[PDB]
DNA sequence: TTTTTTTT
């Protein structure tokens, strides 16, 4: 008898795996009998225990194969090929709904019975976020629309404020929400060529704490970033395709993604200021700090950074109508679950705690 | 029974697919029964639903194959070979005649039964562009002739003007129309080597916002742009072939394509000034801004950036005799459709609104 | 008759052999008769003598294969695949538990009957380390807990004090205990990128001997390192993911490991001071120096450098419940062995000798 | 039945086709019935219509093969091998008379029954070019002989002098005649080293407008060009064989071809100036401009760039005995055809119109 | 029946072909009927006509092979392997022995039955050479044996004296008979590192004219060469191995080869002087300039810096016993020719013509 | 083996 390459390709597809080693190592685990498989029995990893029993017989024959890496290479190509197809054919709206469907699926586990997460802790995080800026949930919705529409020369938001004002915290959550990559452009102009390479097929990008010059007036360290960015104004404008590069790999040509720039309080060339559609001023606030000092499970579990938290905020605040049609059914079910588990008074009590700088809980 | 490599190759010719992963991805979709293929039923992508029923039988056998990437590679080579043959044997006029047929096919879809494009919005865009400069349609015809004739050392048009003058917007539409590439020359002088290698077999090129000097007086921060271009006089002149470069590939020798450069008003060594056969100067004009500020669907659908819009302009403004004979038939049908779909009064109403800076529609 | 690739892969898994050439060389040795094998008879290397008799038959056929390196590559891939699976799935507590099992296996050999080590000399090592700082064993337990929880901000420890005050000694033993890498941030800012690349997939990092500035007032040579660290805030706080680079490789994105910073008595910015959960002062003490003179078998055998010594310290001092439940069984057996071989009076006599600055043994 | 790789390789030889993609594309055209082939019917391309009938049967079987690129790779190597064998064995005269036969074969077609351009125009181009400098034919005959004899140090000719002197125009015609290569050195030495590899197996080379120094007083930017020139003096002198480079392929050592190098009026190291038997510059004669401006089919059809124009000029001006012996049959035959279609008075009419600076074809 | 790979390998060995393309090309020529092979009839190339008849049948089958380049790659490996064996095994004397035998075969070419350069035009070269300076044949023989023995310290001679003195001209000529290279030290030490590192595996070496700093007081330009070489004690002495280095390459270890230093009349430290066996100074000579001016055929066929002209000078002056013991056969066989064809009077006439500075071939 | 890294 012979290996079914088809079943391996299915497993790669269903796990959305695209590392040949991870795929290989995972598939090899199935060669022992699932009936005693302690990973199955302890229900430790779904990407194992869902599949072991299905794939078992083929895994045993695969364990004898002399071609093992070639089989995995073909499977990984298929997963990569599907991403390529999607990049050229989905609407930006559909991409976002797909991404949301995956987060919602992860939320299904986290707050499941096997779910380790305390939904009350995660809901506490939403209170702290809704304090960080005026009209926070409206700001998120405006950003999401901006990213979907991707209007040329109206594509980039500037975050600036003192050190320790939560700008990278907020960027992290948006980036996990949408998917994308961070970039560092405080660099020499040569390595920069490969640095920009990682934007390929990404949805967002974030430029992390770019450095101005002469900021030592405000005691800011000076550096490359701003002067270096002004050369790349084309990539911001997104008005035409550009050519992007990776190590040992020939170029690809695409429009450079929309995104966010984070910055200390340097000044900026208005040639670049003109390219930011919007600017948000962050500020340190004492009650956030004193609340947070008394609420450190927020930090310990990274709740405040995580896109799951922003999604929960939108589900709480926004009308069902604002979500694209197919996910509205899941959105309604989560809304019901949230309202069942939390009164408004409980949420308002939490917000009042944050304002009072006590620990969020009481 | 065995895979027809011939049928795969034929699909790649039919679709003009260049990427082995994109080819692989799309051919796999045909493995499921077209009898119920939701993509077919929803009529979403022409390159799928036209072909699924035909290729289904072969795709089922391809889905089992162990060679898959090899079969796709040969198919992609066949498409690339056809481009090489065409590049060496067509007149530039035939190349453009082919390009127009492809756009016209896309227009037949866009405004066809599936009809996703509103021809009213698209024609409103034509009025906006025809307003952007005097005698706009005449200027387009001049540029096309210049690119077709490709007279040596009379090959390049310079666009100069301040920010938001619209020069990029015009250049973007022209690039789509002819199918060129955009290139960045403000980079360091080394990886220009792999950068300019993108121009292999291209019809047209545009260099974007070439960073010069002297403009620091006016807050144009300077760079290698003008330095690098004056280093490349022969590439502009197209007087003799040059070598071009790609990773893991030996050099290709050919004449460098004609085209366009965009400039905020840095200084220019007159060794470059000699080589631009023409320069056009652009100016911001507030009433256009007030127009877009209401008619924002122009930007959101990117209408004013598209070669599709320029093609519609030419069909409106030019004699049928200016077009190559083989398409004059298709041109006549589109002229007829346009006269049916719009009265001159409607177009005059639009163009009046554009001049008023009110929203184009009323 | 055929080679069993399976038996090779099993050997590679059991030896955890990462390198193809090392794997190849060792397997070939088995082709001679284990029954006469001098290396077996002299019990020189466990990775040989445990295995020779089992693999002999397959090694004989392997010796005639024409595919030899191909067999080894597939085997080595299996070992690498296992590591990446583990990296993405194990808890940090699981990782540490595995690491301890490895050390315990080496100790079983070292102090075995074949064992060349002397448990008494190695216990003399523990007495010296326990004198290096107050409450040494509690300090280790605290450090380990901090690494396992990896709580944001609460992640990094500072070792401070003069030259030859022992800080590097303790760093090295901890680094051996946990596994990890040393890094040197005194470099000029451009080279740091590949330097930090070393951190990829590590459990710990140690920053060696970061040079401040202006400590030359105290004869300390000045350097960049302190400023470089103050510019790496997110790497230390560990709240969000970071991109990391290696030579000829594409970047990977992960949370930067926790770790240790070591320095002489440079002044430290408050911005940097706030990064550290804890600071430990090392001071030179003469009685340790005079003891080391008279007890230099400690240095010669590198006892005081080794994680093996720290593990013995944990076994002697900590309650059994403090260890991960699985290994508690082995821990009891080692505690029992140590209790048998040393009365507390013997151990305390050694501690007294170190306090005298006299030789440890009497 | 199976593909004849032999018949494929014959086509590659007889086309002298030298690119694997071009060859692949070309041969696949033959898979259709030649009996109805539109290209055959058009007599569109000789390299098709001469061969379609002969290769049809083999091309049909080739069209089904799975090895298609491998077949073409072997065929291409046969053509490269033939070139390398000629490269060493032939005398420089024997090479040149082969080159002339190829050009004569084109002219037989160009002015043939297909006749796609008319010798009156090309002869007018001869008149324009003979007008460009005194006794043009004689100066050409010197250059040809100098390149055949290839005397060291007395080996290269300079074209210094202003923009739009036509110096590049003359270089292009000579290079087309000789079948050399252009090369660039205005470059980093660490890619210059590999770029020169194109010099393998070339009769002649040309270096274009190389960046000197001192010319910055005349706005000519100084640069790497002349540094790289005055370095490699061996290559200029042709003093000894030296190595040359290719990707994924063996290097080669051989003497460097003789050549021309061109500049505008930079300064030049006398250490370099030593190495040039002729050291000439070129300056505008404005009436020719006014003629060309009124004779633009000359420039549009690139006639005054072509090598064909030089060969026509030599056929007119030179004695039959000045040519290599074997071709003198064809030389006489073409000398007839000129005289059969032109009086001297017609040629002199053209030349006075040119000298007068007026549209030629009265 | 099938291609003998063996026969191909014999031909490669017999012709000492290093290049897979040459081997392929030439071997394919044998496929045509030997019995009327017109290249054989013309006796153009021994590498063909000596072999075709033997290889014919195999070459026919070779031309039908589908595998051709693979056969040639193995054959080329055989020749390279042969070289690398001998390169490691043999003595410097054996190496020079074979190098003589090669260039004696080059004489058998130069004056074979085609006589394609006149043996006595070459004798006129020998005259100009021996007329150059005192006793030149002995000075050659001494320097040659000095370089063969490579005795420590006794390894470097100093060619002082002004420009155009011939010191460059002569030393370069010896390298034809030896291999080797010349190198630069007029440079700051960061260059000098790589510059020294060039010299790997050279049989002999030379230095560029030392522009001695500390010698500018003689009204001369300088580079750092004096302090450089005076510090480079070991490399000159050749008493021990040293390490050598190149861009992007690791170090290599060898005894630094022996050689020649050249300069104008610069200053020298007594220590740097102690590095040399001989001080020489050259000068331009009024007879010799006017002789070459009147004798330029010696330059035209590259005689005056050929090695063959030195070989003939040796075969003239030096007795048979002074040559490699078996090669002495050939020495007699050329003494036969030279002493037959040339009277001492024509030799003395030629020498006297150089002594009068007049044209040698009176 | 190119490439990326080195080199700069
Ligand atoms: N608005 C705020 N007021 C007070 N403390 C804040 C505020 N925002 C963040 N913090 C505290 O500062 C810590 C760091 O937050 P964060 O990393 O997002 O700051 P940042 O200023 O955006 O950083 P960076 O400029 O380095 O990207 C938080 O974990 C929290 O403890
Ligand atoms: N002539 C114009 N008058 C007013 N607004 C204009 C004009 N042209 C363009 N715009 C506005 O400016 C935006 C950007 O135009 P565009 O990028 O083409 O200008 P540009 O001069 O090429 O700019 P840049 O040098 O920044 O790339 C357009 O999307 C439109 O909103
Ligand atoms: N507390 C101590 N008192 C006296 N001597 C010490 C002490 N600790 C270490 N030593 C001596 O110092 C030597 C070096 O130890 P170690 O490298 O750990 O010192 P360090 O302070 O970390 O130095 P550095 O910062 O230079 O690496 C040890 O081998 C030992 O001889
Ligand atoms: N006698 C002339 N009078 C006027 N223009 C001339 C004359 N000869 C040549 N030119 C012009 O020179 C233009 C460019 O020619 P060419 O590129 O060969 O010159 P060049 O000196 O090599 O220039 P560059 O230094 O810019 O490369 C031609 O298009 C031609 O019109
Ligand atoms: N002694 C001589 N007298 C006259 N002409 C000579 C003499 N030697 C060589 N020549 C001619 O002069 C040319 C230059 O000689 P060469 O470069 O060898 O001299 P050099 O002294 O090494 O010069 P430099 O120190 O300037 O590099 C030779 O190639 C030859 O044509």
PDB file of N, CA and C and ligand atoms in Angstrom, chain C residues 128 132 162-169 209 264 283-285 288-289 292 299, ligand 3:
ATOM      1  N   UNK C 128      30.801  26.409  48.421  1.00  0.00           N
ATOM      2  CA  UNK C 128      31.385  27.684  48.012  1.00  0.00           C
ATOM      3  C   UNK C 128      30.350  28.613  47.389  1.00  0.00           C
ATOM      4  N   UNK C 132      28.653  32.584  48.275  1.00  0.00           N
ATOM      5  CA  UNK C 132      28.864  33.747  47.421  1.00  0.00           C
ATOM      6  C   UNK C 132      27.849  34.855  47.683  1.00  0.00           C
ATOM      7  N   UNK C 162      32.394  45.003  41.282  1.00  0.00           N
ATOM      8  CA  UNK C 162      33.738  45.074  40.687  1.00  0.00           C
ATOM      9  C   UNK C 162      34.138  43.825  39.916  1.00  0.00           C
ATOM     10  N   UNK C 163      35.280  43.949  39.235  1.00  0.00           N
ATOM     11  CA  UNK C 163      35.886  42.820  38.541  1.00  0.00           C
ATOM     12  C   UNK C 163      36.261  41.720  39.532  1.00  0.00           C
ATOM     13  N   UNK C 164      36.211  40.472  39.069  1.00  0.00           N
ATOM     14  CA  UNK C 164      36.503  39.326  39.930  1.00  0.00           C
ATOM     15  C   UNK C 164      35.630  39.321  41.175  1.00  0.00           C
ATOM     16  N   UNK C 165      34.389  39.765  41.039  1.00  0.00           N
ATOM     17  CA  UNK C 165      33.420  39.638  42.113  1.00  0.00           C
ATOM     18  C   UNK C 165      32.436  38.498  41.893  1.00  0.00           C
ATOM     19  N   UNK C 166      32.577  37.740  40.813  1.00  0.00           N
ATOM     20  CA  UNK C 166      31.903  36.469  40.664  1.00  0.00           C
ATOM     21  C   UNK C 166      30.668  36.505  39.801  1.00  0.00           C
ATOM     22  N   UNK C 167      30.307  37.667  39.273  1.00  0.00           N
ATOM     23  CA  UNK C 167      29.006  37.796  38.629  1.00  0.00           C
ATOM     24  C   UNK C 167      28.948  36.923  37.383  1.00  0.00           C
ATOM     25  N   UNK C 168      30.022  36.909  36.601  1.00  0.00           N
ATOM     26  CA  UNK C 168      30.055  36.076  35.407  1.00  0.00           C
ATOM     27  C   UNK C 168      29.999  34.597  35.769  1.00  0.00           C
ATOM     28  N   UNK C 169      30.647  34.210  36.866  1.00  0.00           N
ATOM     29  CA  UNK C 169      30.566  32.826  37.320  1.00  0.00           C
ATOM     30  C   UNK C 169      29.119  32.413  37.515  1.00  0.00           C
ATOM     31  N   UNK C 209      28.488  42.412  30.616  1.00  0.00           N
ATOM     32  CA  UNK C 209      29.428  43.472  30.935  1.00  0.00           C
ATOM     33  C   UNK C 209      29.192  44.730  30.106  1.00  0.00           C
ATOM     34  N   UNK C 264      30.067  46.337  35.846  1.00  0.00           N
ATOM     35  CA  UNK C 264      30.781  46.980  36.936  1.00  0.00           C
ATOM     36  C   UNK C 264      30.045  48.260  37.312  1.00  0.00           C
ATOM     37  N   UNK C 283      30.236  41.664  45.827  1.00  0.00           N
ATOM     38  CA  UNK C 283      31.454  42.267  46.324  1.00  0.00           C
ATOM     39  C   UNK C 283      32.536  41.216  46.511  1.00  0.00           C
ATOM     40  N   UNK C 284      33.786  41.545  46.210  1.00  0.00           N
ATOM     41  CA  UNK C 284      34.862  40.578  46.416  1.00  0.00           C
ATOM     42  C   UNK C 284      35.110  40.366  47.897  1.00  0.00           C
ATOM     43  N   UNK C 285      35.402  39.123  48.262  1.00  0.00           N
ATOM     44  CA  UNK C 285      35.662  38.748  49.642  1.00  0.00           C
ATOM     45  C   UNK C 285      36.904  37.879  49.728  1.00  0.00           C
ATOM     46  N   UNK C 288      36.957  33.917  50.351  1.00  0.00           N
ATOM     47  CA  UNK C 288      36.735  33.106  49.157  1.00  0.00           C
ATOM     48  C   UNK C 288      38.015  32.964  48.348  1.00  0.00           C
ATOM     49  N   UNK C 289      38.779  34.045  48.238  1.00  0.00           N
ATOM     50  CA  UNK C 289      40.004  34.029  47.448  1.00  0.00           C
ATOM     51  C   UNK C 289      41.026  33.066  48.032  1.00  0.00           C
ATOM     52  N   UNK C 292      39.831  29.507  47.570  1.00  0.00           N
ATOM     53  CA  UNK C 292      40.069  29.017  46.216  1.00  0.00           C
ATOM     54  C   UNK C 292      41.520  28.619  45.997  1.00  0.00           C
ATOM     55  N   UNK C 299      38.315  24.964  40.611  1.00  0.00           N
ATOM     56  CA  UNK C 299      38.533  25.673  39.358  1.00  0.00           C
ATOM     57  C   UNK C 299      38.945  24.712  38.263  1.00  0.00           C
TER      58      UNK C 299
HETATM   59  N1  LIG G   3      33.141  37.109  45.585  1.00  0.00           N
HETATM   60  C1  LIG G   3      34.393  36.898  45.174  1.00  0.00           C
HETATM   61  N2  LIG G   3      35.405  37.256  45.988  1.00  0.00           N
HETATM   62  C2  LIG G   3      36.658  37.064  45.578  1.00  0.00           C
HETATM   63  N3  LIG G   3      37.090  36.549  44.427  1.00  0.00           N
HETATM   64  C3  LIG G   3      36.068  36.230  43.628  1.00  0.00           C
HETATM   65  C4  LIG G   3      34.722  36.343  43.928  1.00  0.00           C
HETATM   66  N4  LIG G   3      33.948  35.884  42.875  1.00  0.00           N
HETATM   67  C5  LIG G   3      34.834  35.513  41.986  1.00  0.00           C
HETATM   68  N5  LIG G   3      36.126  35.564  42.433  1.00  0.00           N
HETATM   69  C6  LIG G   3      37.310  35.360  41.624  1.00  0.00           C
HETATM   70  O1  LIG G   3      37.075  36.064  40.413  1.00  0.00           O
HETATM   71  C7  LIG G   3      37.338  35.199  39.298  1.00  0.00           C
HETATM   72  C8  LIG G   3      36.507  35.622  38.122  1.00  0.00           C
HETATM   73  O2  LIG G   3      35.122  35.524  38.497  1.00  0.00           O
HETATM   74  P1  LIG G   3      34.008  36.217  37.632  1.00  0.00           P
HETATM   75  O3  LIG G   3      34.363  36.086  36.205  1.00  0.00           O
HETATM   76  O4  LIG G   3      32.645  35.596  37.900  1.00  0.00           O
HETATM   77  O5  LIG G   3      33.978  37.692  38.057  1.00  0.00           O
HETATM   78  P2  LIG G   3      33.187  38.983  37.591  1.00  0.00           P
HETATM   79  O6  LIG G   3      33.064  39.988  38.662  1.00  0.00           O
HETATM   80  O7  LIG G   3      31.836  38.507  37.078  1.00  0.00           O
HETATM   81  O8  LIG G   3      34.094  39.524  36.466  1.00  0.00           O
HETATM   82  P3  LIG G   3      33.963  40.161  35.038  1.00  0.00           P
HETATM   83  O9  LIG G   3      32.915  41.251  35.195  1.00  0.00           O
HETATM   84  O10 LIG G   3      35.276  40.735  34.645  1.00  0.00           O
HETATM   85  O11 LIG G   3      33.670  38.982  34.113  1.00  0.00           O
HETATM   86  C9  LIG G   3      36.934  33.840  39.829  1.00  0.00           C
HETATM   87  O12 LIG G   3      37.520  32.790  39.072  1.00  0.00           O
HETATM   88  C10 LIG G   3      37.500  33.883  41.245  1.00  0.00           C
HETATM   89  O13 LIG G   3      38.886  33.583  41.190  1.00  0.00           O
END
